[PDB]
Amino acid sequence: ERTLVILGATGSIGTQTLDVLKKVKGIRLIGISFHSNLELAFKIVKEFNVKNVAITGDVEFEDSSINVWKGSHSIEEMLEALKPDITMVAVSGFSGLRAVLASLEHSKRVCLANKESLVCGGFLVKKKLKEKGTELIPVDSEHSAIFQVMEPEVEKVVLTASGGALRDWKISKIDRARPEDVLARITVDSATMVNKAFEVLEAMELFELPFEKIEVKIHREGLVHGAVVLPDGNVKMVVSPPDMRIPISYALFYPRRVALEPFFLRTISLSFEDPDPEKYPAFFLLKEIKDSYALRTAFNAADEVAVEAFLKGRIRFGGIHRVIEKTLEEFQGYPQPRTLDDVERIHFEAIKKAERVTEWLS
Amino acid sequence: ERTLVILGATGSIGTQTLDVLKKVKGIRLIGISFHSNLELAFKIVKEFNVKNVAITGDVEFEDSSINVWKGSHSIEEMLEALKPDITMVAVSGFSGLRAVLASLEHSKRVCLANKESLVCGGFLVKKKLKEKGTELIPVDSEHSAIFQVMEPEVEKVVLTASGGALRDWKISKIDRARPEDVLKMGARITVDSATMVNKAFEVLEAMELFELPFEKIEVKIHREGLVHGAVVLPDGNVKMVVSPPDMRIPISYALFYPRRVALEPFFLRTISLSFEDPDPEKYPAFFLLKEIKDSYALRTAFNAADEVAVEAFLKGRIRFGGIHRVIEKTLEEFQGYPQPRTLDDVERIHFEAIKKAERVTEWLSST
Numbered sequence: 001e002r003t004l005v006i007l008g009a010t011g012s013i014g015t016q017t018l019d020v021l022k023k024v025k026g027i028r029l030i031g032i033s034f035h036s037n038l039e040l041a042f043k044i045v046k047e048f049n050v051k052n053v054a055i056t057g058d059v060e061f062e063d064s065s066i067n068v069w070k071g072s073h074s075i076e077e078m079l080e081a082l083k084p085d086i087t088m089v090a091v092s093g094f095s096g097l098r099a100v101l102a103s104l105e106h107s108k109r110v111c112l113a114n115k116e117s118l119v120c121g122g123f124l125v126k127k128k129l130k131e132k133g134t135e136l137i138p139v140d141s142e143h144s145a146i147f148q149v150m151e152p153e154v155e156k157v158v159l160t161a162s163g164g165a166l167r168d169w170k171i172s173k174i175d176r177a178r179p180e181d182v183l184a185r186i187t188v189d190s191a192t193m194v195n196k197a198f199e200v201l202e203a204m205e206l207f208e209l210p211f212e213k214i215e216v217k218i219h220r221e222g223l224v225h226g227a228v229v230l231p232d233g234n235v236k237m238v239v240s241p242p243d244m245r246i247p248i249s250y251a252l253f254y255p256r257r258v259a260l261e262p263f264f265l266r267t268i269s270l271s272f273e274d275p276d277p278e279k280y281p282a283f284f285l286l287k288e289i290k291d292s293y294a295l296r297t298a299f300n301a302a303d304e305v306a307v308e309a310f311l312k313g314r315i316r317f318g319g320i321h322r323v324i325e326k327t328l329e330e331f332q333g334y335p336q337p338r339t340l341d342d343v344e345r346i347h348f349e350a351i352k353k354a355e356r357v358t359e360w361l362s
Numbered sequence: 363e364r365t366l367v368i369l370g371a372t373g374s375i376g377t378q379t380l381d382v383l384k385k386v387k388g389i390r391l392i393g394i395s396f397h398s399n400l401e402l403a404f405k406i407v408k409e410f411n412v413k414n415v416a417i418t419g420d421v422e423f424e425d426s427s428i429n430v431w432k433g434s435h436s437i438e439e440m441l442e443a444l445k446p447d448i449t450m451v452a453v454s455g456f457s458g459l460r461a462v463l464a465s466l467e468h469s470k471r472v473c474l475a476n477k478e479s480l481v482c483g484g485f486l487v488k489k490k491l492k493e494k495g496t497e498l499i500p501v502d503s504e505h506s507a508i509f510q511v512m513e514p515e516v517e518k519v520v521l522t523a524s525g526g527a528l529r530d531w532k533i534s535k536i537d538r539a540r541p542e543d544v545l546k547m548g549a550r551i552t553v554d555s556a557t558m559v560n561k562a563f564e565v566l567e568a569m570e571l572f573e574l575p576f577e578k579i580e581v582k583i584h585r586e587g588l589v590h591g592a593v594v595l596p597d598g599n600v601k602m603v604v605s606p607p608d609m610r611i612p613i614s615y616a617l618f619y620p621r622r623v624a625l626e627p628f629f630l631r632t633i634s635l636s637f638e639d640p641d642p643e644k645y646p647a648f649f650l651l652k653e654i655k656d657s658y659a660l661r662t663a664f665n666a667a668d669e670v671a672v673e674a675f676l677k678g679r680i681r682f683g684g685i686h687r688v689i690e691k692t693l694e695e696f697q698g699y700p701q702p703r704t705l706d707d708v709e710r711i712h713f714e715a716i717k718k719a720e721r722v723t724e725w726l727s728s729t
């Protein structure tokens with residue numbers, strides 16, 4: 001009954017969304033976008049009988065049987081043509097900002113699983129949300145949890161974090177870590193807690209929260225996905241298994257609850273500790289960058305470069321936060337971006353500077 | 363500004379409500395009821411400058427400075443005169459059923475802190491509710507918690523229980539326990555927590571308040587007493603409400619809803635949360651729920667038998683294990699009773715059950 005477009009269908013969230021569609025009825029998939037993974041894309045288009053494809057990268061997809069949009073405006077033009085009830089925005093990276101803006105324009109509901117859009121261009125997304133009235137539901141497990149318990153008056157919003165792959169390591173050994181010791185961008189971002197820094201900025205945008213009302217706790221066990229501390233002593237917490245199909249399903253079928261597998265209650269350990277500034281320096285850059293979309297966009301651009309460089313073996317793990325920090329210095333005093341073009345300009349300039357810094361660090 | 367009547371103002375919930383009104387602005391207390399505690403009633407009247415009082419016991423209240431109602435209809439009379447924005451119904455015992463019904467007739471919101479009204483006459487309350495459209499918000503901390511996270515497609519509604527004073531006791535030792543074992547909240551509530559009859563009442567109240575089938579309710583013993591309620595969703599999500607064990611929290615919530623009052627925020631630390639199924643051998647009276655849930659006759663007799671048995675325990679007439687036996691045997695005498703249809707039908711069952719439970723209690727007391 002409800003029509004769906006999945007942007008970034010070939011990624012993790014994209015394929016987990018497909019899995020949900022196999023498990024629950026009522027949504028018809030009518031289009032996808034994907035970047036370069038044609039082998040998986042072909043498999044999707046075959047299994048789901050998808051007649052509309054937007055290609056965002058540099059590959060071919062002939063098929064006279066299906067409509068194929070191609071180029072820098074493929075997502076936007078596909079969406080205009082299809083006017084889906086629901087768009088799952090699961091594109092990775094900075095291209096997520098235009099993907100989200102276009103989905104808000106042409107869709108009745110947007111399921112948001114791209115972080116860059118809010119980190120770099122949250123003001124643009126909020127402006128478009130207000131103009132269009134489109135429903136927006138976060139897919140991120142922590143924002144999904146908060147969405148389910150949020151109210152207008154809160155003391156604090158608590159986001160939880162694993163602490164990443166090196167949460168147990170000594171401060172002294174972390175600097176030297178290799179991909180082998182860490183392992184995927186998301187995986188590296190969890191280890192530096194840059195992913196958690198993105199989530200704080202996203203929560204500020206989604207829930208109109210001041211920076212001061214957000215708390216991050218390392219939560220070893222992975223059960224509590226968010227909590228809301230209220231003025232009266234009450235705390236509303238959300239617990240679930242750590243499976244992204246849960247918040248995917250919630251954003252897709254809201255206000256209905258999909259029957260998956262209930263989390264029946266048993267005795268549990270719930271630990272909450274403050275992140276160590278000496279272990280997670282890039283995370284603690286939040287206070288420096290929060291008020292500036294120029295700084296936030298530069299923060300994201302430098303992290304993209306540094307993670308890629310870390311993965312390629314050009315720098316050690318300790319080099320990530322240093323690339324970010326050094327790149328941010330070069331954007332101090334930048335005026336607040338006002339348009340999409342301003343944001344895209346900062347982004348590309350930040351990528352250039354971060355690469356220069358990465359070269360120095362080796 | 364909102365006007366408030368507190369029915370049962372001299373009791374535990376009553377005084378905790380008064381404490382909230384001292385800490386928080388926006389609600390004016392214009393009327394109280396009390397049963398017999400004149401000392402406390404007069405000092406409430408003096409400290410809150412209350413001009414309106416209903417007496418429900420056979421007591422004298424000398425005052426020309428203020429309006430005083432007396433006799434069997436004093437609550438209904440005062441409420442009809444005052445028409446408060448909010449009535450807190452904190453009367454103890456069976457007379458809460460009449461009180462809640464009169465409160466729904468003359469208030470815009472009822473804050474419900476009386477269990478007998480829903481246990482015994484929930485069908486009567488639900489009918490009056492849809493007639494008037496009055497708001498009813500539960501004050502009980504478990505129901506308050508569930509109220510905060512409830513949604514139509516819950517898989518399970520989870521109520522938590524301390525397990526009460528004898529929770530760590532061997533089953534053989536439980537039968538012979540004495541008041542001193544249970545009492546070292548209030549006396550009745552403490553016993554009911556020990557037998558888990560208080561939880562049986564809360565399950566029945568949850569079914570009424572939230573329109574849940576009995577099969578959708580689970581009760582877990584929760585040693586830490588941090589989680590006050592949870593809902594399990596069909597998708598894997600579970601929404602839990604945590605707070606300090608302070609009744610002022612849910613009292614404030616019900617009075618001020620949709621506003622949250624600033625009290626003391628609970629900040630998160632490392633916690634263990636335990637959830638265990640109650641042992642039917644340890645809490646026999648709690649597991650009578652499946653037998654009584656569909657009958658307001660059996661639920662009224664359940665409540666009445668409990669009232670008699672708890673008092674008899676506290677008076678030293680029977681040991682702790684005699685409480686569930688008084689309840690079980692009294693219920694046996696009401697097997698097959700027809701479903702009550704009116705307030706009057708309910709009150710008749712209550713009276714019969716009290717008298718029948720008294721006889722059983724004698725029997726068990728004589729051994």
Ligand SMILES: NC(=O)C1=CN([C@@H]2O[C@H](COP(=O)(O)OP(=O)(O)OC[C@H]3O[C@@H](n4cnc5c(N)ncnc54)[C@H](OP(=O)(O)O)[C@@H]3O)[C@@H](O)[C@H]2O)C=CC1
Pocket residue numbers: 007008009010011012013014033034035036037038056090091092093095096113114115116139140141186244
């Ligand atoms: N993974 C998770 O558990 C979570 C992810 N998110 C957010 O979701 C977003 C995507 O996550 P994830 O699914 O893991 O990422 P993946 O890399 O696993 O997949 C993302 C998709 O985006 C496509 N893509 C890549 N580059 C571009 C581009 N330049 N333009 C348009 N599309 C492109 C990829 O295509 P292809 O494979 O063909 O090259 C793929 O289809 C991120 O912002 C992430 O932070 C949020 C919460 C949880």
Ligand SMILES: NC(=O)C1=CN([C@@H]2O[C@H](COP(=O)(O)OP(=O)(O)OC[C@H]3O[C@@H](n4cnc5c(N)ncnc54)[C@H](OP(=O)(O)O)[C@@H]3O)[C@@H](O)[C@H]2O)C=CC1
Pocket residue numbers: 369370371372373374375376396397398399400418452453454455457458475476477478501502503547548551609
């Ligand atoms: N206490 C708690 O923590 C909780 C209590 N509840 C429920 O709230 C209700 C009352 O609670 P609680 O305040 O603790 O009880 P209390 O015994 O502390 O107070 C009961 C109040 O009702 C009055 N009263 C006594 N008998 C009668 C009667 N026959 N007719 C009219 N009024 C009478 C009493 O007046 P007086 O003092 O003059 O005799 C007193 O003001 C009960 O249903 C209880 O289960 C629910 C959740 C939590």
Ligand SMILES: [Mg+2]
Pocket residue numbers: 140141142143199
């Ligand atoms: Mg997350």
Ligand SMILES: [Mg+2]
Pocket residue numbers: 502503504564
């Ligand atoms: Mg309770």
